[PDB]
């Protein structure tokens with residue numbers, strides 16, 4: 042059989058080169074990098090090369106940190122709770138601004154901070170499916186400890202005005218964090234242009250393994266560790282390093298940035314072919330703006346039949362997609378989809394819809 | 397060349413069967429287990445089997461939780477900070493008792509809680525290298541939120557009186573957590589006999605991959621999540637599951653408990669052969685008790701030459717061991733060491749010592 046995977050904003054396939062580069066550290070190179078003997082220092086060159094790939098992947102400077110975490114959820118929890126202790130409890134800046142579109146790892150943590158007494162304003166989305174940047178400014182009081190706005194939304198693919206939010210935060214002296222998970226491998230990511238203090242990402246959204254992530258911390262910026270222990274990652278995140286996943290995630294970031302032109306010109310062309318073909322049937326409307334989007338995502342809405350039925354049908358024909366709040370059908374492509382797959386999805390989608 | 401790895405309390409080699417069982421989930425079975433389509437539910441049987449292996453591995457009940465974490469450091473941080481919010485800030489039980497022998501993931505986090513105003517007593521070790529259990533009782537005031545005592549020490553191999561501490565905690569109504577990382581695969585681990593509310597472990601200490609751990613939470617016991625997001629692990633720990641490492645860690649726990657007789661009878665016999673051979677030279681004394689120890693660990697001290705020099709020398713001859721606070725030389729064996737390796741280590745150790 043031949044199945045079609047169109048659920049890449051939920052997770053992606055590991056690139057074969059990533060698995061290949063991870064294998065030796067699952068085999069004979071199992072030393073703890075903190076060890077002083079040869080099994081430990083034996084791992085240091087590959088770890089350094091992987092970290093270098095990450096730094097260059099997000100345009101991080103040598104003075105900055107790219108701390109290895111276990112997923113984007115850890116990065117987001119670490120940002121929000123760290124600034125809760127450093128900037129909210131100790132500096133009296135008991136206010137955080139974020140958006141209603143943020144991943145549950147951000148919104149649920151913000152709810153937890155609210156339970157402790159922190160004041161959090163979740164900026165409402167507009168009809169364009171985006172946040173303006175004027176909204177954060179309206180909400181940035183002199184007690185805002187942190188602004189947290191995701192770079193690209195996982196349900197609609199919509200790109201938020203990261204850069205202008207960073208400029209507002211820079212002029213107003215408030216820390217800026219961006220959840221950039223959906224942006225890696227989709228659009229160019231530059232922490233300097235974003236003026237980001239914190240940036241989150243997760244490997245399994247750009248063809249690395251599930252269970253490893255990264256938090257960019259700007260030079261000089263403090264953040265009380267979420268993982269105390271003080272051994273690893275310059276004492277900022279303790280725990281024995283996941284060497285294979287570090288190497289693999291480095292390679293995945295490298296491949297992801299190397300495929301940016303292909304992502305916009307080819308994957309985006311497949312998404313536009315799919316979307317244009319799919320809107321030529323009854324009343325199926327795309328949910329959100331069609332310009333400020335990452336190249337791989339389309340979110341289509343169909344009459345009065347729920348999206349879950351359409352997805353159950355698609356899955357019966359071995360086509361995997363997800364839902365999306367509008368419910369609508371989220372189809373998210375990748376580097377490994379082909380035009381034949383897209384034509385097939387147009388046919389199976391139409392036949393399933395009329396049925 | 398033929399190198400000798402005697403540093404297994406620092407980390408271990410992945411069992412070939414563990415790598416084998418992980419490989420398919422690094423290849424074609426890359427679905428997100430939260431997905432509703434076939435790529436997601438396709439992973440559910442192997443995840444369930446792995447979790448079953450963990451539960452049976454620590455004698456957890458079906459009503460209990462064995463939450464998948466990213467390492468023992470995450471489990472320990474989660475226990476201590478969770479009971480800080482639930483039992484210290486909300487219930488006024490602003491006291492925690494632990495030991496001075498605990499891993500830095502516990503002691504450093506306790507230091508962080510002290511910086512917030514929590515009163516923590518670190519029980520001092522005695523001349524026997526152990527904690528009595530009478531000490532926790534002496535310190536268990538009616539404001540103790542948590543007792544945290546490691547099952548086996550990583551530097552000396554000494555087993556602490558887990559069970560009696562659990563009985564004291566049960567009679568006095570105080571939560572009991574045990575860091576059991578060094579115990580898995582070394583001695584039988586039973587959360588019921590221990591009367592443990594929380595138990596930590598980490599795969600790479602029993603031949604699973606680095607970067608995954610487990611926290612046993614007793615039925616009914618609450619613990620505010622460290623990873624908010626509320627999606628995965630019954631909402632107790634959010635983040636996309638590390639499917640390959642979950643499967644591998646399950647197999648590693650199974651193999652580890654299946655080798656307990658071999659660990660005590662063979663690995664312990666190799667440790668006793670090594671230790672008895674090594675104490676027949678000048679004034680090299682074993683640091684700590686020689687009865688209440690896990691079968692794989694020996695911690696030897698040598699005259700007035702520091703341990704780091706002896707270990708640099710050993711590493712020059714491709715023999716990997718670590719230091720240990722006494723500094724002494726920690727040699728920690730495993731299922732994969734042979735008697736030939738041990739004889740060779742006796743010779744190289746003697747020649748290095750006289751040189």
Ligand SMILES: *Cc1c(COP(=O)(O)O)cnc(C)c1O
Nearest residue numbers: 280281467468469499550577598
């Ligand atoms: C090794 C060890 C740890 C650290 O585990 P990580 O996987 O590095 O998080 C914690 N406690 C004990 C007793 C250990 O031996």
Ligand SMILES: *Cc1c(COP(=O)(O)O)cnc(C)c1O
Nearest residue numbers: 112113114144195222243635636
């Ligand atoms: C998928 C996603 C996450 C969750 O990442 P995990 O690896 O599951 O921790 C967080 N934020 C965004 C924007 C995501 O798309």
Ligand SMILES: [Cl-]
Nearest residue numbers: 122265266267
């Ligand atoms: Cl914290």
Ligand SMILES: [Cl-]
Nearest residue numbers: 477620621622
């Ligand atoms: Cl928490």
